[PDB]
Amino acid sequence: TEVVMENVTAFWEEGGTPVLKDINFKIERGQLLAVAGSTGAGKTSLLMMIMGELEPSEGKIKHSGRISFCSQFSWIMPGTIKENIIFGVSYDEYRYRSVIKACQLEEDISKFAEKDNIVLGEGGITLSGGQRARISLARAVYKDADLYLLDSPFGYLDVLTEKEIFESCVCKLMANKTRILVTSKMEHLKKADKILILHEGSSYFYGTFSELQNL
Numbered sequence: 001t002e003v004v005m006e007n008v009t010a011f012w013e014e015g016g017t018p019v020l021k022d023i024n025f026k027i028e029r030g031q032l033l034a035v036a037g038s039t040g041a042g043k044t045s046l047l048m049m050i051m052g053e054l055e056p057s058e059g060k061i062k063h064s065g066r067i068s069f070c071s072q073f074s075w076i077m078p079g080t081i082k083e084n085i086i087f088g089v090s091y092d093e094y095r096y097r098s099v100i101k102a103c104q105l106e107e108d109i110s111k112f113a114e115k116d117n118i119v120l121g122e123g124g125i126t127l128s129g130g131q132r133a134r135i136s137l138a139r140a141v142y143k144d145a146d147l148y149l150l151d152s153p154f155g156y157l158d159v160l161t162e163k164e165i166f167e168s169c170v171c172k173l174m175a176n177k178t179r180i181l182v183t184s185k186m187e188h189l190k191k192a193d194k195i196l197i198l199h200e201g202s203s204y205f206y207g208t209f210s211e212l213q214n215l
């Protein structure tokens, strides 16, 4: 067992309404959990509990090891595209290349005269929303970790590009890794080992896509 929540209830504000209520799930090592639900349902808050920024008022939580987190809000720091993706981690050519390929960034990078040394975040290039999202995803995936927390990482991408990168990056490149993906897309829920649908803090559904189909 790699990540467990058992009867978890939590509050952002003392005496407030709970942001998560009686949440239950289990992820085995190397599995994929999809976390879905409407705005404000508590999906990012769930990831924050795993990262220790939100403590449970009821229930138990299990997780161990290093975390790599991809925010739903893409970001860039001043530096090259290579520096933004490696972001202080040791460099390896093969690992870097495999990530940028899985994230479709090789096409973008190949069009620049400076290639991977193009400078971002310093007033030169203005990246599109989808470029910034794929760079942010690549940064999180390049980091070596035991658990990957990918919070709606496909912002600004069209549905086919999102499908392709879900398959090449989250399913293929990351096949051996424990992953929690916040996402609402049907194919992602179908390919996940488990699905957790949140609604106003509560567990709307927890199980497999197959079990939901059977209902």
Ligand SMILES: Nc1ccn([C@@H]2O[C@H](COP(=O)(O)OP(=O)(O)OP(=O)(O)O)[C@@H](O)[C@H]2O)c(=O)n1
Binding pocket: 012, 013, 019, 037, 038, 039, 040, 041, 042, 043, 044, 045, 046, 072
């Ligand atoms: N520091 C915080 C973070 C969140 N919240 C509240 O906790 C609820 C859930 O927030 P969040 O987990 O961020 O919702 P998401 O499910 O991630 O919504 P979205 O899809 O829009 O990202 C919201 O009512 C939000 O106002 C809060 O009070 N204080």
Ligand SMILES: [Mg+2]
Binding pocket: 043, 044, 045, 072, 151
């Ligand atoms: Mg969120």
